[PDB]
Every structure is written in C-alpha cells, then in structure tokens.
Symmetry: C2
C-alpha cells in the first residue's frame, strides 16, 4: 500500500511542501469497486499544480484559498498524486506565502487547441472548451470541442450517465496515425 492508486513510475517526494488550494472538485467514482477521487488545483510561489486525491478523508482540507502542507506525495509527469501514504496538514502562518497573480490567472487559463495538438501523445489535458456536437453510440460518446481557431474530437467510453461550456479534467491526448483526439482515461472527469 505505499504507492496504491498512484499512477506507475511516479516519483516520491518525501520533503514537505506548502501549497495554496485554488480549486477542488466533488468526489466521483472513476472505476468500479475502487474508492472515489477528486481533482484539485493548487499553487506555490513558483508554479501551479494539478492534483489527483485518492484519500477522501482529505476532501475537507481541499477548500478554496486554504493553505496546506503535503509530505510524501507523488509526482506523475508534473501532476501530483496523493494517497493515504501522504501527510497533509493545515499550514502554519510561518510558511504561508502570497501566490503571484499571474500564476493564478494561468491556472484559470485554458490552453488553446492548436497548441494542444502539438503536445506529446499521452499528455493530460485540462480545460474549459466549447461544444459543437453530441453523438451517442452503444459504447462511446463523441464530442467535438472548439476554440476561436481550431477543434478536436473527444471520445468517452466510460459511462453514459451524467453526460449532457464544458470543463474537462485529465483527458488523454492521442495523435494517432489519424488526426488528434482527446480520449477518456482512468481519471477523466466532465463538469458543466
């Protein structure tokens, strides 16, 4: 149980780090038979992070503008994964800082699709996008999301419930032989 529910190959960070919680999502079930998870966005003086939390006992600590310290958390390609191995404490005023405004704006900022298509395959994509279609198949749901200059197709095979201006969390970029698409993954989540 040390690296349980953590994406494989993730690095372990023993050293404590103090962050400010920007956003958090409601817990949801990402797979049959396993505990729920939620997505979060946090920030330090130097950068903003995207976070997956698998210990539901930590949900209360993840509230807007709350300062917390995390130890023994995991890092999977610039993304922080937290399970029961991690220690999370409400921060003391001594390590409390001010988060630069530009970082927060950036955290709210959504990447553009044109640049998205240029990323390495398997990169995790987060953002708010505009929707042009909803196509329903037995085993998948397909969206087309747009910006001012481009569009990409989104595939969701996970469940058809709760699917009906769209915020996406942890979708997988695929530059196939074909054109690029965004595909659902282990931790893929959709908000309105």
């Amino acid at each position: 149980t040390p690296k349980k529910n953590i994406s494989k190959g993730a690095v372990l960070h023993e050293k404590p780090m103090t962050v400010m919680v920007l956003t958090a999502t409601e817990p949801f079930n990402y797979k049959e038979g396993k505990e729920n998870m939620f997505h979060a966005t946090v920030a330090t003086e130097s950068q903003y992070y995207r976070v997956k939390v698998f210990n539901m006992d930590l949900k209360e600590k993840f509230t807007e503008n709350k300062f917390i310290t995390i130890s023994k958390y995991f890092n999977s390609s610039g993304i922080l994964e937290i399970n029961e191995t991690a220690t999370v404490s409400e921060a003391a005023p001594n390590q409390m800082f001010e988060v630069p405004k530009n970082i927060i704006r950036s955290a709210k900022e959504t990447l553009k699709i044109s640049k998205i298509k240029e990323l390495d395959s398997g990169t995790l994509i987060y953002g708010v996008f505009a929707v042009e279609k909803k196509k329903v198949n037995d085993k998948s749901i397909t969206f087309k999301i747009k910006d001012n200059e481009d569009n990409i197709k989104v595939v969701w095979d996970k469940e058809q419930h709760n699917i009906n201006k769209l915020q996406l969390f942890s979708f997988h970029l695929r530059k196939g032989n074909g054109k690029p698409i965004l595909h659902s993954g282990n931790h893929s989540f959709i908000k309105g």
Copy 2:
C-alpha cells in the same frame, strides 16, 4: 401514365389471367408523397405469385380467398406489379379452379438462409424469420435473422414503427438483406 410506378423493364401482359388471392398486406407508405401500396400473394394451378399493388382502389378485391382476374398487369423479374392501367374484375366461377396443396405450401414456405445467400444479387426476398440481434443507428437499423442453422444480416435505412419480411433486397463481401423501395415489415 402507363407503366407508372412500375419497376422499369417490366414486361406487360395484356392477356387476362385468373388468380386466387391468398394473402394481402395492409396498405402502407413506401415513399414520400407517393400513394400507398400493399403486398399480396396470389396463386394459379401452376405456380404462386407475389404481387405489388399501387392502385388503392383495388384493396377490397385483394381479400383472402377471393378469385380475381387481372389483365395488362406487369411482370418485373417474376414479380407482378399492378397500377391503374391494369384491369381487375371479380372472377366467374368457371375459372375458379382449385389450387393444389403443394403450391400453397410453397407459397407459405420460407426459403432458408443458406440457399438464400446463393441467389443472384438483386433478388427479392420474402419470408418469416427469428431475430436475435437489433441495433439502432442514426441512419439505419440492423437486425439478425436466423434459422437452424444459418444466419443473415438485415439493413433498414428508412423510417424507424419497428419493435416477416416483404421485398427485401439480397446483396458483396458478405451477403446482407437490404431494404428497398417496397420493403415492408410485419409482425
């Protein structure tokens, strides 16, 4: 106006022929705007015929077990097509012959899928089948019909009142039964 609504290349038979109505279908809409049609099965002593009727005035004459005489009807590849040009009269008792048991048996008989697949492409298929698969798509609906023991896939790209087959078209890489102009489905 003659040969109206008739499948093209159909031969014309001016000579009157007297037949017995075995089965008739309820009139239905096979094409947008066009008048309704119904399917029928009739028989003479030598063979059974499948009939497509495009004149709705003729619906009563096509009642079960009724003897009627038809002249100037059309024959499109072994299929009888009737429009308003054709003359249909109630038959007189002297031609009201008896249809042999074997012919009616053939008329009721549904061909088996294994031999169906061997028929020429474009052949029209009629029969009663059992379904074990039903798939709904935006632009079509697909089911599977089977016998003991063989199977074929049926494609329907028309209006989707769907929950016995008439005039389906047999089709390349793998055989299918496809909907056409006069395709009708009964329960």
